[PDB]
């Protein structure tokens with residue numbers, strides 16, 4: 001679902017870490033260095049995470065309730081500074097292009113021609129960052 | 140190294156969660172149910188985790204400072220008892236075979252013919268449990 005702030009492939013859920021409030025489960029994986037939690041759920045999704053290397057993409061902006069086309073660049077690591085909630089740490093496997101960003105936009109799906117490749121994790125003045133989900137998925 | 144109590148593949152290191160949870164928020168992956176944690180490091184490792192099948196293997200026992208041949212049984216889960224920390228919990232993605240094990244033996248590598256497939260996580264009456272690192276890796 002285009003407006004869904006999470007990624008759902010099969011029985012798996014890919015979701016921002018701080019967007020988690022729910023129950024502890026056996027299948028829960030957590031990447032503190034990527035603000036990502038992965039777990040299994042009872043329902044099934046139609047999302048698909050490709051094993052590609054695309055950069056010509058598009059993503060969902062929540063506070064505008066619309067999709068922006070975007071060209072992104074892959075970063076091995078990047079200094080993600082400190083906001084009120086969490087400190088200035090290092091986040092691995094990021095995607096970055098220019099685009100609008102405002103609080104409450106995390107989970108916004110980023111897609112290429114093959115499927116969902118990431119979700120909004122942070123942004124700044126006219127630049128937005130995504131978790132590269134391709135790294136946390138098997139071909 | 141054969142006596143190294145950790146798996147070190149590429150820029151990633153694999154350790155027991157219940158022993159290295161101090162720097163947890165800086166880790167790149169965590170599985171609370173399987174007692175696994177993964178950190179990044181500058182150095183590059185020689186270790187190799189295969190995507191295979193083997194049940195006939197060998198593992199490093201620190202308190203005897205030598206290797207034991209061992210035949211392991213893949214459990215999807217099993218519940219360990221209570222020591223002087225972490226009361227009787229359940230653990231998932233395990234390998235278990237016959238072999239000596241006393242406190243301080245974890246990280247002891249479990250190798251097959253192809254490479255490393257686990258580290259010691261639990262030990263009891265002539266039985267030692269490993270984490271199935273193959274369940275946490277991509278071919």
Ligand SMILES: *CC(=O)[C@@H](CCSC)NC(=O)[C@@H](C)NC(=O)[C@@H](NC(=O)OCc1ccccc1)C(C)C
Nearest residue numbers: 080081082083096101102103104106122123124127
């Ligand atoms: C879900 C939520 O509320 C968002 C808010 C998005 S609005 C920006 N979560 C966040 O963690 C926000 C507060 N994070 C940040 O603003 C980053 N800022 C940042 O450096 O990103 C800009 C950037 C541009 C290009 C490459 C990398 C980053 C801070 C945590 C530093």
Ligand SMILES: *CC(=O)[C@H](CCSC)NC(=O)[C@H](C)NC(=O)[C@H](NC(=O)OCc1ccccc1)C(C)C
Nearest residue numbers: 219220221222242243244245260261262263266268
């Ligand atoms: C993994 C380690 O080496 C450390 C030593 C810490 S020393 C302060 N871990 C443990 O001691 C670990 C948490 N406890 C156990 O492994 C043992 N668990 C148990 O009773 O089950 C034994 C067993 C289970 C399944 C298969 C085979 C054996 C006890 C609690 C010491």
Ligand SMILES: [Zn+2]
Nearest residue numbers: 052054112114
């Ligand atoms: Zn693609």
Ligand SMILES: [Zn+2]
Nearest residue numbers: 191193251253
């Ligand atoms: Zn093998």
